[PDB]
Each structure stands twice: as structure tokens, then as C-alpha cells.
Amino acid sequence: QVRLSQSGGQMKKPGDSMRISCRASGYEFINCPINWIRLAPGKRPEWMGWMKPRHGAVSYARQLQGRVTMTRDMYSETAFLELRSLTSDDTAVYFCTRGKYCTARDYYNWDFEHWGQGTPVTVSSASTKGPSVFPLAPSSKSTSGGTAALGCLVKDYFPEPVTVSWNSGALTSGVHTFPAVLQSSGLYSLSSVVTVPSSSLGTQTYICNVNHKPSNTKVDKKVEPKSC
Amino acid sequence: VLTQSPGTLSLSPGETAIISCRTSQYGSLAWYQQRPGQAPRLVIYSGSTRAAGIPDRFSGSRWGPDYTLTISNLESGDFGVYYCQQYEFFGQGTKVQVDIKRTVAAPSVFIFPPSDEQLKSGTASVVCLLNNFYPREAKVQWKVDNALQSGNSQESVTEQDSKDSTYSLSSTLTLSKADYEKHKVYACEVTHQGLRSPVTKSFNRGEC
Amino acid sequence: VWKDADTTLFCASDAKAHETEVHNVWATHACVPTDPNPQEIHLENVTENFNMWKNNMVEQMQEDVISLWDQSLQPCVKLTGGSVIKQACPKISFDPIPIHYCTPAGYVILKCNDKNFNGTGPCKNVSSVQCTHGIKPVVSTQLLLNGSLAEEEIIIRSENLTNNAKTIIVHLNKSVEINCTRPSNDIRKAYCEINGTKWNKVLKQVTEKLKEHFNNKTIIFQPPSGGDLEITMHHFNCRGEFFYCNTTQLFNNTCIGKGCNGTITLPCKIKQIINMWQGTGQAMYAPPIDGKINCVSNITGILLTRDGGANNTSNETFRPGGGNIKDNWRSELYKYKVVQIE
Ligand SMILES: *[C@@H]1O[C@H](CO)[C@@H](O)[C@H](O)[C@H]1NC(C)=O
Ligand SMILES: *[C@@H]1O[C@H](CO)[C@@H](O)[C@H](O)[C@H]1NC(C)=O
Ligand SMILES: *[C@@H]1O[C@H](CO)[C@@H](O)[C@H](O)[C@H]1NC(C)=O
Ligand SMILES: *[C@@H]1O[C@H](CO)[C@@H](O)[C@H](O)[C@H]1NC(C)=O
Ligand SMILES: *[C@@H]1O[C@H](CO)[C@@H](O)[C@H](O)[C@H]1NC(C)=O
Numbered sequence: 001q002v003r004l005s006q007s008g009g010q011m012k013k014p015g016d017s018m019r020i021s022c023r024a025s026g027y028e029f030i031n032c033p034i035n036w037i038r039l040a041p042g043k044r045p046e047w048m049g050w051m052k053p054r055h056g057a058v059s060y061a062r063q064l065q066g067r068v069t070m071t072r073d074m075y076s077e078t079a080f081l082e083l084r085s086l087t088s089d090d091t092a093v094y095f096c097t098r099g100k101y102c103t104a105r106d107y108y109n110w111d112f113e114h115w116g117q118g119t120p121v122t123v124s125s126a127s128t129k130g131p132s133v134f135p136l137a138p139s140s141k142s143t144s145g146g147t148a149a150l151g152c153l154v155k156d157y158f159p160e161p162v163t164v165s166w167n168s169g170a171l172t173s174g175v176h177t178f179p180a181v182l183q184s185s186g187l188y189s190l191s192s193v194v195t196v197p198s199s200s201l202g203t204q205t206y207i208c209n210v211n212h213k214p215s216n217t218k219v220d221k222k223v224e225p226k227s228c
Numbered sequence: 229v230l231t232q233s234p235g236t237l238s239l240s241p242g243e244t245a246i247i248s249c250r251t252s253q254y255g256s257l258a259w260y261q262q263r264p265g266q267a268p269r270l271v272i273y274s275g276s277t278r279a280a281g282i283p284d285r286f287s288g289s290r291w292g293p294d295y296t297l298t299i300s301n302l303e304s305g306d307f308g309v310y311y312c313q314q315y316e317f318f319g320q321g322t323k324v325q326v327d328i329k330r331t332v333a334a335p336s337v338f339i340f341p342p343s344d345e346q347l348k349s350g351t352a353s354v355v356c357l358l359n360n361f362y363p364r365e366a367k368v369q370w371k372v373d374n375a376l377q378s379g380n381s382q383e384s385v386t387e388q389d390s391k392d393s394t395y396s397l398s399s400t401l402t403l404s405k406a407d408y409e410k411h412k413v414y415a416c417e418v419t420h421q422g423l424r425s426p427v428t429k430s431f432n433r434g435e436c
Numbered sequence: 437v438w439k440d441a442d443t444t445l446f447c448a449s450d451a452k453a454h455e456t457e458v459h460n461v462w463a464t465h466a467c468v469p470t471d472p473n474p475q476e477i478h479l480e481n482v483t484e485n486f487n488m489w490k491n492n493m494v495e496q497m498q499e500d501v502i503s504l505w506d507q508s509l510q511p512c513v514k515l516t517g518g519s520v521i522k523q524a525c526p527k528i529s530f531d532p533i534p535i536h537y538c539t540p541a542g543y544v545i546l547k548c549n550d551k552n553f554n555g556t557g558p559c560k561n562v563s564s565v566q567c568t569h570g571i572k573p574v575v576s577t578q579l580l581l582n583g584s585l586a587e588e589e590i591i592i593r594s595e596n597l598t599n600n601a602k603t604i605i606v607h608l609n610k611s612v613e614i615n616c617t618r619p620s621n622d623i624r625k626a627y628c629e630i631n632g633t634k635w636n637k638v639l640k641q642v643t644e645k646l647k648e649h650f651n652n653k654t655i656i657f658q659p660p661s662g663g664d665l666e667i668t669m670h671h672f673n674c675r676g677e678f679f680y681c682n683t684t685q686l687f688n689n690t691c692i693g694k695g696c697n698g699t700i701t702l703p704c705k706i707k708q709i710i711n712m713w714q715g716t717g718q719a720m721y722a723p724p725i726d727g728k729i730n731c732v733s734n735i736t737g738i739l740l741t742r743d744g745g746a747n748n749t750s751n752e753t754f755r756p757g758g759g760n761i762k763d764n765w766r767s768e769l770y771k772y773k774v775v776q777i778e
């Protein structure tokens with residue numbers, strides 16, 4: 001029974017190199033090529049290249065040319081992948097694969113029936129940045145017959161995660177904290193909002209409490225209606 | 229080209245999922261399933277052939293350049309993300325997630341102008357909240373002085389609420405303080421099945 | 437009426453029973469004498485489908501060449517499977533001879549004679565023969581040596597050009613001599629000389645054929661990306677010695693798109709510690725024979741793999757292929773297929 005075992009996950013800084021292994025068993029290692037596909041959330045699965053164990057022949061994906069190396073060890077039937085000049089964009093889960101059809105005489109590489117369990121690799125700076133917290137003020141007039149939405153914008157922090165509570169956790173009903181988004185700057189931002197009776201807007205006080213462990217940052221911010 | 233649609237399917241167990249791939253070049257296409265925290269798995273190869281272990285609830289079809297994976301009677305182990313493959317290339321993926329049926333609810337739309345605290349930074353973020361709606365399918369478009377915006381906005385959606393089975397969406401438009409001060413009318417337009425018409429919430433910069 | 441079939445071919449040759457040479461010795465005991473007056477029957481109003489990539493004749497030849505090499509080029513020390521075999525390794529007389537492959541009773545070889553046939557597809561000019569032409573079992577990598585030339589234009593061959601894992605075989609219509617030498621008086625060091633004018637002109641013609649198959653994209657050549665020396669270098673056997681030649685200069689895009697006109701000299705080395713293409717492992721052979729070791733050969737083809745990758749650029753990149761020596765036999769056996777009568 002064909003099995004593909006990979007090496008453990010790792011964390012890396014930008015500029016580093018990485019190497020992961022894939023030990024194959026259950027079949028004649030020489031006869032079929034081995035592929036490396038990487039998966040990253042919100043991105044198309046990316047074929048990085050194949051490697052034929054017999055003579056170590058390789059075909060690297062054009063967009064990775066010069067940064068990637070595929071070797072193998074015949075005796076221990078293990079394939080190896082190496083990636084240089086890592087960036088944030090290299091943060092993904094790395095798989096080794098091999099096609100379904102393989103004989104001593106013939107193969108089709110691409111119907112990937114067999115996958116390794118996957119090696120997750122994270123590339124990020126050790127730098128940490130605290131969040132800016134901006135208030136999302138309710139509105140102008142108090143509508144004594146409806147409800148008001150308010151919140152705070154937790155912007156430009158790195159890395160994940162931030163957390164948001166309201167009134168030190170006493171306020172939870174109608175609260176919505178959205179999953180963070182990754183901006184072009186490389187930094188994260190999320191929104192937290194809470195819907196409340198409008199009549200309470202000039203009576204009850206609303207504080208959003210932002211926690212960002214990596215930067216050792218705890219910020220309290222009062223969201224209040226604009227005066228004009 | 230290999231274009232996979234749709235991006236997200238929100239379905240209840242029992243319903244059927246219809247995922248499609250449009251391709252520029254004919255040839256053997258495969259479909260892969262990926263359950264959360266697990267390595268992908270070959271489902272269909274050579275267009276319509278079912279891989280070993282795959283029940284006949286999965287089936288492949290092709291009309292012209294359109295290859296389709298349908299999955300009848302969704303079970304728990306059928307949810308996850310699906311990809312199409314042709315040679316070394318893959319589709320963007322289709323996320324098939326569990327949806328709990330409930331009655332249609334139009335969103336409540338709120339819009340938040342930039343903080344005076346933020347404007348001192350040099351950036352301007354306009355936030356548009358779509359609150360407690362169902363189904364998940366919802367379109368947002370930003371308009372500034374009635375001009376459609378592209379590529380200066382990011383969205384975010386919450387998990388289906390465990391109590392009322394609704395979703396909430398937050399979109400954020402980001403402009404420089406300079407670019408921002410150049411325009412007056414900022415608006416987010418929301419189309420949702422719960423609405424008779426696309427609802428637009430807007431404010432005029434400078435006035436309260 | 438017939439049908440495609442697979443049988444055990446026999447082989448024929450013009451081997452000399454007196455010759456001490458290795459290919460001749462093998463052929464004497466494995467083959468029969470060639471037919472002086474062969475018989476070719478051109479079939480009119482007959483269209484037949486050919487596939488060089490699923491032609492089992494290739495498999496049988498491969499078995500024979502592995503046989504021949506094991507029974508001849510025995511290493512002094514065999515290192516395979518964690519064990520060590522120590523044999524005797526006498527220096528041998530080595531020069532490949534043409535081997536004909538032929539069908540038994542009940543079976544016939546169909547031959548394609550379309551001057552632009554690419555290996556796969558239907559054929560109009562089909563003839564019926566008992567034996568293939570004489571094929572020299574020249575084991576090589578990157579460059580196909582001493583083979584047959586294409587009649588008309590340069591022919592690109594591939595089981596699928598869109599599959600970057602399938603080998604591309606370039607078939608030349610004009611040979612380019614390669615002159616490899618290990619002089620007399622480092623004894624392992626050697627070199628090969630190519631006419632730069634002829635080569636860059638053939639290579640220029642090859643870039644123009646590949647453009648016909650790849651939407652007029654910029655064709656670019658490059659050295660191999662990796663692998664053992666047996667594929668990152670032109671690997672071949674001359675007079676018994678194992679040669680490894682560096683073809684980096686051979687794939688010079690500069691002389692394709694001035695001063696390049698001259699004699700290209702590729703740096704070579706003869707190795708004694710090699711990896712067996714048989715697929716076994718690593719072997720140790722004796723030091724090279726003393727004196728000038730030389731062989732002049734026809735480059736008659738190139739093996740290429742195309743760079744894959746989810747890029748969007750308007751240019752393709754090719755690199756000298758090799759490894760599967762079965763492909764070497766495909767390049768000569770492509771116009772043949774075995775059928776059984778009824
Ligand atoms: C090329 O590959 C496709 C599938 O990818 C296959 O259907 C077709 O037959 C192949 N072409 C040849 C000439 O074998
Ligand atoms: C087949 O043979 C005929 C007769 O000689 C010739 O005219 C024709 O060009 C040949 N076809 C090909 C494809 O070479
Ligand atoms: C060879 O010709 C056949 C049919 O004439 C065609 O289908 C195939 O793509 C061709 N192959 C190459 C490598 O040109
Ligand atoms: C090399 O080519 C020349 C002319 O093309 C030919 O005369 C000679 O027989 C060839 N050598 C071989 C096939 O070994
Ligand atoms: C070889 O083929 C090329 C086209 O690829 C052509 O330009 C050249 O004239 C041919 N050489 C011959 C027929 O001797």
C-alpha cells in the first residue's frame with residue numbers, strides 16, 4: 001500500500017532557506033515521478049515541480065526557478081525539497097504527491113491519488129506591531145425607536161491575533177468581531193461592532209478592549225457619538 | 229486558463245453541490261476534495277471517472293469547456309474545499325461549507341465615516357456593516373461621487389450565528405487622507421435577496 | 437486482414453563470428469544473418485494508426501541492450517543494494533553494430549513512409565516488411581548519436597506536447613559531427629569538438645520548428661536544472677570508456693538571436709565510478725586504456741524536456757533531456773508496428 005510520510009512543520013524568517021523530506025513506501029520508488037504541491041489558504045494550489053528518482057531528473061515551475069531544489073536518497077527512498085530566499089508569500093502547507101497510474105513500463109504523473117500528510121511552513125518577521133484602534137461612532141441623532149450600531153476598527157497590526165471584548169466582557173449581546181483581513185502593507189486589520197438600543201447612547205458607556213499579545217499591547221477605547 | 233466557480237457554496241446536508249471548472253484547453257481534468265486539517269484526496273480523474281473509495285453520489289460531467297463536479301445528498305464528510313486540476317494547474321477552489329436553513333432576512337446596513345483620530349494619520353477608512361442576514365449570498369459595492377470602486381476594499385464575513393443562523397459582513401474602503409478630501413459622496417450599495425432593491429447607505433464628507 | 441499485436445521478435449545482423457568485438461559476439465549467438473534481398477510491399481488504399489510511445493518493440497530492444505551490457509561491460513566492483521560484488525574487468529573492444537528486428541511466422545511489421553510523420557497518428561504511405569532497418573544500440577543522453585535522419589523537415593516528436601513530463605524528441609534532417617577525444621600523454625580528462633557554424637544553424641532551425649508547435653513564442657534553451665551527471669551532461673560510451681561531456685556551450689542562445697562562428701570545444705571526463713543505466717546502482721571500472729581514444733559521431737537528434745509552471749510569460753524554455761534510454765529506441769523504431777495476420 002503506497003504511503004508518503006513527510007517531515008514536521010517549521011517556522012522561518014524572511015531570507016531563510018527551508019528543507020522538507022518525504023519518505024515513500026509500498027511501491028518501487030524508481031518507477032514514478034514525485035511532485036511537490038503547496039497549498040495556502042485563499043490561493044490556487046501550486047505545483048512546484050516533479051522529480052524522477054531514477055536519475056534525479058527535475059522540472060521546476062518557471063515562477064520558482066532558481067529558488068527551488070529537488071533531490072532524493074535512493075536507499076532510504078526519500079524525496080527532498082528545498083526552497084531559498086523565503087518570503088511571506090511562501091507561507092503555505094507543503095505536500096509531496098505521486099500519480100495514480102504507475103508501472104515499471106509506464107506512468108501518468110498528474111492524477112494525484114497519493115499525498116503526504118503535508119508539511120506546514122510559516123514565514124514571518126519576528127517584528128511585532130501593535131494595533132491602531134479607531135472608534136466607529138454611532139450616529140448623529142438619538143432615534144428613540146430603533147437600535148444603533150457602533151464599534152472600533154483595529155488596524156495595522158502584526159502578527160495575528162488580536163482579540164476584542166466590550167466593557168471588559170460584560171457586553172456580549174449583539175457583538176460581532178469579524179475575522180481579520182490581510183492588507184497590502186503586509187499588516188492586518190479587523191472590525192468589531194455591537195448593536196445597542198439607541199436610548200442608551202448617552203447613558204451607558206461603551207469601551208472596546210483590544211488585546212494583542214505579540215506586541216504586549218492592551219488598549220481600551222471609548223466609542224462615543226460625535227458632537228456637532 | 230482554469231476558472232473554478234463558485235467561490236463558496238453554503239449548503240445543508242441532503243442538498244446537492246454543483247461545482248464547475250471552465251478551461252481554455254481540453255484534456256484530462258481531475259477533481260480533488262480537501263477536508264479541514266487533512267491532505268487533499270482525488271475524487272474524479274479523467275473528467276468523470278470515480279476514484280477508489282468514492283461513492284456514486286459524486287459524478288463528473290463536461291459540456292463544451294465546462295467540466296462539472298456534482299455531489300448529491302451532501303453528508304458530513306463531503307464538506308471542505310474542492311479543486312479542479314489539469315496537468316500542473318489548479319482552479320482557485322470551491323469552499324463547500326455547512327449552512328443551516330432559516331427564513332430569509334435582509335441585512336441592516338450601517339456606514340461609518342473615518343475617525344477624526346484616524347484622519348490625523350494620513351489614511352481614511354470607511355466601514356460598511358451588513359448585520360444579521362440570510363442567506364449568506366450578499367454583494368457590496370463602494371461608490372465615491374457615484375464612481376464604482378475597485379481594489380481599495382476588503383470584506384470579512386462571520387461564521388453562521390449559532391443562535392439565529394444569520395451572517396454578518398464587514399467591508400472596508402481605504403483611501404489616503406488626501407484622496408479622501410478630494411471627494412464628497414461616499415456610499416456602499418448592498419444587494420441581497422431579502423431586499424426588494426439594492427439598499428444604499430451614504431454620507432456627505434464634512435457635514436454631520 | 438490483420439490486427440495490432442505483440443510477439444517475440446527475432447533479431448538479425450551482419451556480425452562476424454571471428455570478431456572479438458562485444459556487439460558482434462552478442463549478435464552471433466542472439467541473431468541470425470540478414471537477408472541479402474529483402475522484400476518491401478507498399479500497401480495502396482491502406483491507412484494505419486501508429487503510436488511510437490506505446491510500441492512494445494522498444495521494450496524488447498531495451499531488454500536486449502541491458503542483456504548485452506551486463507554480459508559485456510562487467511564492473512570490477514559492483515555496488516548495488518548495500519552489497520559488494522568483486523568481479524574481473526578486462527578492457528574490451530567496443531563499437532556498436534546495426535541490429536535488425538524481425539517478425540516470426542504469422543506476424544508482419546508495418547512501416548510508415550510519410551516523410552513528415554511525427555510518431556503518432558494515421559499514415560498514408562504504409563508498406564509491409566519482415567524486418568526493421570539496422571539499428572545501432574547507441575546508449576546516450578541529451579544527444580542522440582549515430583541515428584537515422586529525417587527525410588524532409590526537422591520533426592518534433594512527443595506523446596503530448598502539453599505534458600511537461602513527456603519527453604520531446606527532436607529529429608534532425610542534417611547531421612552535425614561531434615568529435616570526441618582523449619589524447620595520449622590527467623588521463624581522465626578529455627574533450628569534444630563541434631562545428632559551431634553547423635550547430636548554431638541547426639539549432640536555429642530547431643527553434644523555428646518549436647515555434648510552429650508553440651504559437652510563435654520565444655524559444656529558449658537552458659542547461660539541465662539538476663539530476664545525476666548522467667543527465668546534466670552528455671553521457672555516452674566510447675570504445676568501452678564512459679564519457680561525460682558538458683553541453684553548456686551547446687545550448688548558447690546568443691549565437692541564435694556574432695563571433696560564435698568557430699569550433700566549440702566541450703570539456704569531458706571519463707569516469708570509472710558510474711551509475712548503471714540498467715537501473716541497478718553504482719559500478720567501478722578500470723582506468724582508461726593508454727593512447728588516443730577517439731570517436732566521431734553523428735548528432736542526429738536531441739532529447740528535450742519543457743519547463744512547466746503556472747507562469748504567464750510569452751516564452752518557452754527547453755533543457756537537454758535523457759535518462760529513459762527506451763526513448764533512444766523510440767527515435768529509431770517510430771515508423772514500425774507489429775501486426776498479426778488475422
Ligand atoms: C494527450 O493527453 C490527453 C489527455 O491529457 C489524451 O486524451 C490524448 O490522447 C493525448 N494525446 C496523445 C497523442 O496521446
Ligand atoms: C505518400 O506517397 C505519395 C506517392 O509517392 C506521395 O506523393 C506523398 O507525398 C506521400 N505522403 C507523405 C505524407 O509523404
Ligand atoms: C502528430 O500528428 C497528429 C495527427 O496528425 C497530431 O494529433 C499530434 O498532435 C502531432 N504531434 C506532434 C508532436 O506534432
Ligand atoms: C553519419 O552521417 C553521414 C552523412 O550524414 C553518413 O555518411 C554516415 O554513415 C553517418 N554515420 C553513421 C550513421 O554512423
Ligand atoms: C531541414 O528542415 C528545415 C526545417 O525545419 C529546413 O529549413 C531545411 O531546409 C531542411 N534541410 C534539408 C531538407 O536538408
Ligand SMILES: *[C@@H]1O[C@H](CO)[C@@H](O)[C@H](O)[C@H]1NC(C)=O
Nearest residue numbers: 613615616617627629730732
Ligand atoms: C578530431 O579532433 C582531433 C583533435 O582533437 C583531430 O586530430 C582529428 O583529426 C579530428 N577528427 C575529425 C574526423 O575531424
Ligand SMILES: *[C@@H]1O[C@H](CO)[C@@H](O)[C@H](O)[C@H]1NC(C)=O
Nearest residue numbers: 630631632633634697698699
Ligand atoms: C564549419 O562548417 C562550415 C560549413 O557549414 C565550414 O565552412 C567551416 O570551415 C567549418 N569550420 C571549421 C572550423 O572547420
Ligand SMILES: *[C@@H]1O[C@H](CO)[C@@H](O)[C@H](O)[C@H]1NC(C)=O
Nearest residue numbers: 665668669682683684685703
Ligand atoms: C558545465 O560547464 C559550465 C561552464 O560555464 C559550468 O558553469 C557548469 O557548472 C558545468 N556543469 C557541470 C554539471 O559541471
Ligand SMILES: *[C@@H]1O[C@H](CO)[C@@H](O)[C@H](O)[C@H]1NC(C)=O
Nearest residue numbers: 684685688690691694695696
Ligand atoms: C555563447 O557565445 C558567445 C559569443 O562567442 C560567448 O561570449 C559566450 O560565452 C557563449 N556562451 C557559452 C559558451 O555558454
Ligand SMILES: *[C@@H]1O[C@H](CO)[C@@H](O)[C@H](O)[C@H]1NC(C)=O
Nearest residue numbers: 574581582672731732733734
Ligand atoms: C558512431 O559511428 C562511428 C563510425 O560509424 C564510430 O566511430 C563512433 O564510435 C560511433 N559513436 C558512438 C557514440 O557509438
